[PDB]
Structure formats: structure tokens, C-alpha cells
């Protein structure tokens, strides 16, 4: 069966729980993750698109 890993989000093959900060792979447990001091805080995500930066949430001003 061909399962999928979503580039942005959580998938059954890979689910990250922020609350407990734990990684679950195919139901089983993988471990816990700390936070890098360099971890970005502005919300800008760069590794979700080939040549684009996700600058934030929906902005209806820019259009549909």
C-alpha cells in the first residue's frame, strides 16, 4: 500500500504532537523533540514550496 507523507501537516505515517512534543510513526512511537535556539518564530516557513515562503495565515486583502 502506498501511504503518503504530507509536506505540510500531519500524516498517519508521520504525526507530530506539539502538546506532548512526541513523534508517532505508523502508530508506534519515535521519541521526543526539543527546540533549536535558531528555531524561527516569525512563522515564515520556507521548506513547504519550491520557490516560495509561507509568510503567515490567510490574508483576504491580497485576493482569492
Amino acid at each position: 500500500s502506498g501511504m503518503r507523507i504530507l509536506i505540510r501537516g500531519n500524516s498517519p505515517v508521520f504525526n507530530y504532537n506539539k502538546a506532548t512534543k512526541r513523534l508517532t510513526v505508523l502508530g508506534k512511537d519515535a521519541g521526543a523533540l526539543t527546540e533549536d535556539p535558531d528555531e524561527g518564530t516569525a512563522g515564515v516557513e520556507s521548506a513547504v514550496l519550491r520557490g516560495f515562503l509561507i509568510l503567515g495565515k490567510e490574508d483576504k486583502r491580497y485576493g482569492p
Binding site: 490574508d59 486583502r61 491580497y62 485576493g63 482569492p64
Partner: protein, 64 residues
């Protein structure tokens, strides 16, 4: 009415790009394209801004 469709956050940046481009037609002769002018004219009506961005396509909002 046309400017009601164009996205709010891009009416200026679009308009300037058209206006500047329209100026390029008045400077150099032989570039007076009727179809291009008619196509791009409605985007001019706005408080134009300035940006180096060279648009390829201008967005419009139609039924969301």
C-alpha cells in the same frame, strides 16, 4: 467598478506597473499596441505605487 474586483492589496502596485508601461509606449514609437492598451487600461485607475516587481499576470476576483 472594475477596481472593485482587483485585489485591495494590489490595486496600487498593479496600476503603477501599467502606468509606467504605458509611459514606455509614449516614449518610444512603434510600440503602440491597441490590444495591450485596452487590456491593461482598467488597472491604471488607482493611487499608483512603485515597485521593481515585473508582473506577468494581474489577478481579478470573480465570484470568489
Amino acid at each position: 467598478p472594475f477596481q472593485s474586483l482587483v485585489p485591495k492589496a494590489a490595486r496600487g502596485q498593479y496600476s503603477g506597473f501599467v502606468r509606467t508601461l504605458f509611459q514606455q509606449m509614449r516614449d518610444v514609437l512603434g510600440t503602440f499596441d491597441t490590444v495591450q492598451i485596452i487590456k491593461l487600461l482598467p488597472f491604471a485607475a488607482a493611487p499608483p505605487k512603485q515597485s521593481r516587481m515585473q508582473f506577468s499576470s494581474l489577478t481579478v476576483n470573480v465570484r470568489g
